[PDB]
Amino acid sequence: EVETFAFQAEIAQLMSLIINTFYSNKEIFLRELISNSSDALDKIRYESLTDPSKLDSGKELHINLIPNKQDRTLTIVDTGIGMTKADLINNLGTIAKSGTKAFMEALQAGADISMIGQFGVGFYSAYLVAEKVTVITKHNDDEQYAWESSAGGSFTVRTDTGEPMGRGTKVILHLKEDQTEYLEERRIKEIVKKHSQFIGYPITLFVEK
Amino acid sequence: EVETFAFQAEIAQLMSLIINTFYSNKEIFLRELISNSSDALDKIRYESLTDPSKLDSGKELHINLIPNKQDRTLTIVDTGIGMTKADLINNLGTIAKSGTKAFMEALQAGADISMIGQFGVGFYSAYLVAEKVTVITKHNDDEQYAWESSAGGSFTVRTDTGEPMGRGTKVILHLKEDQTEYLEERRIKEIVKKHSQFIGYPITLFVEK
Numbered sequence: 001e002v003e004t005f006a007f008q009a010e011i012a013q014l015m016s017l018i019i020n021t022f023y024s025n026k027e028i029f030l031r032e033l034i035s036n037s038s039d040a041l042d043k044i045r046y047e048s049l050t051d052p053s054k055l056d057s058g059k060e061l062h063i064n065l066i067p068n069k070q071d072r073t074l075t076i077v078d079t080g081i082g083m084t085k086a087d088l089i090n091n092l093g094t095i096a097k098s099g100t101k102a103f104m105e106a107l108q109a110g111a112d113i114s115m116i117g118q119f120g121v122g123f124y125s126a127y128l129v130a131e132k133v134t135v136i137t138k139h140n141d142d143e144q145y146a147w148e149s150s151a152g153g154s155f156t157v158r159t160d161t162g163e164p165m166g167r168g169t170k171v172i173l174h175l176k177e178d179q180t181e182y183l184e185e186r187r188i189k190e191i192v193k194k195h196s197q198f199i200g201y202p203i204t205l206f207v208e209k
Numbered sequence: 210e211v212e213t214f215a216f217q218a219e220i221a222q223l224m225s226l227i228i229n230t231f232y233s234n235k236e237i238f239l240r241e242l243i244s245n246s247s248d249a250l251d252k253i254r255y256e257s258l259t260d261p262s263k264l265d266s267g268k269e270l271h272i273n274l275i276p277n278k279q280d281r282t283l284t285i286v287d288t289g290i291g292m293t294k295a296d297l298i299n300n301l302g303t304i305a306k307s308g309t310k311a312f313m314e315a316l317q318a319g320a321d322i323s324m325i326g327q328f329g330v331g332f333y334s335a336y337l338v339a340e341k342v343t344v345i346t347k348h349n350d351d352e353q354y355a356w357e358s359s360a361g362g363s364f365t366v367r368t369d370t371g372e373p374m375g376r377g378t379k380v381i382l383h384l385k386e387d388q389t390e391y392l393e394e395r396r397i398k399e400i401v402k403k404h405s406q407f408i409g410y411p412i413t414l415f416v417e418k
């Protein structure tokens with residue numbers, strides 16, 4: 001039912017560095033996640049040019065930002081290409097290996113944590129603000145999956161029996177208690193305007209009722 | 210034999226802006242092209258994880274920089290995924306439309322030409338230094354092609370009967386007379402160190418004999 005995996009050694013080391021380093025410029029996590037969503041959307045958009053049937057699972061290409069004060073969660077939803085079971089368990093970790101090692105070498109040489117995206121491992125900056133990250137994903141060629149990690153060197157992958165999402169990725173950030181500023185509408189708008197002004201897909205902020 | 214196509218209106222406008230604007234920070238073209246090569250290499254590397262036969266056309270994943278003082282050309286060769294005929298004629302132009310329009314709107318609003326890559330149209334910065342650009346490409350699923358443009362609103366595409374390259378893309382920059390500094394070893398090294406220090410593939414500079 002639920003399978004548990006160890007992160008690649010380099011990724012586990014990067015996650016501990018992120019979780020334990022005193023670093024006040026935490027807002028970069030949102031830019032990194034939106035950039036990842038933009039990449040997934042670019043991929044499905046490109047693939048649909050030669051195979052329009054790839055859009056049968058949904059034609060709208062967008063990003064939704066969903067803060068939830070009551071649950072203390074910030075959700076980033078996109079209708080990109082999504083990820084396969086192989087992506088979640090191995091492919092993405094394999095690809096991230098050289099960038100993770102290079103990033104850690106750069107930090108040692110005095111680089112700033114904000115440079116994380118230049119190494120293709122921006123996702124892990126989510127651990128600056130989140131105690132747990134849950135990722136629900138659906139690729140055309142595979143089942144709907146739930147990936148999850150509270151760091152500590154492991155992650156889980158299971159088939160997701162929850163609401164179907166058609167195609168794409170939903171990243172659910174379970175925020176740390178001192179990081180609730182990222183649930184504020186004005187704060188999210190400020191971050192998006194500063195870092196993500198130039199993304200080629202509509203970014204919609206869902207206002208809480 | 211040789212087919213001639215018009216650039217999409219927005220791209221033709223961007224090219225004229227690039228060719229006609231007084232802008233001294235021309236070195237960004239090399240960073241933009243190396244970033245494009247890195248993207249192509251990421252794609253083949255990722256695809257090879259689920260289908261290792263995609264590497265039958267070549268296992269080495271790298272970038273070569275080849276200045277040629279005698280021909281006044283700077284060649285950037287990569288062994289990435291390469292491009293199909295559809296990529297050259299339509300797909301890449303289609304995708305670049307929103308980014309090109311957005312980039313031009315940003316320039317109007319005072320943005321710097323160096324921001325070109327943030328709009329996914331970095332390739333066109335090649336026209337800061339080149340009077341003509343020739344692109345030889347080979348994707349696993351297609352024939353070897355030669356794309357070429359001296360701007361002026363048109364480009365050509367033909368099947369290439371020249372040396373086979375296995376898989377990848379070769380960008381040949383026919384430099385403007387006042388832009389020969391980009392053929393100098395020290396100058397290329399300076400640019401690569403400043404802008405491309407963090408690329409996940411070997412970048413080899415070929416020294417002229």
Ligand SMILES: CN(C(=O)c1cc2c(C(=O)N3CCCC3)[nH]nc2cc1O)c1ccc(N2CCOCC2)cc1
Nearest residue numbers: 033036037039040078080081082083120123135169171
């Ligand atoms: C296909 N795909 C996605 O569906 C997707 C993944 C996301 C992640 C993420 O990175 N992970 C979530 C689980 C663990 C790793 N964060 N937000 C995401 C939004 C998405 O739509 C995807 C997009 C981008 C990238 N990367 C970009 C940087 O360079 C390396 C590849 C890899 C996959």
Ligand SMILES: CN(C(=O)c1cc2c(C(=O)N3CCCC3)[nH]nc2cc1O)c1ccc(N2CCOCC2)cc1
Nearest residue numbers: 242245246248249287289290291292329332344378380
């Ligand atoms: C698959 N592929 C390539 O084989 C390749 C293309 C290159 C270009 C280029 O852009 N063009 C050459 C002909 C006309 C347009 N310049 N140097 C390149 C090196 C390459 O290996 C490729 C790589 C990157 C991208 N883009 C990145 C930015 O975002 C939009 C997509 C699109 C295709």
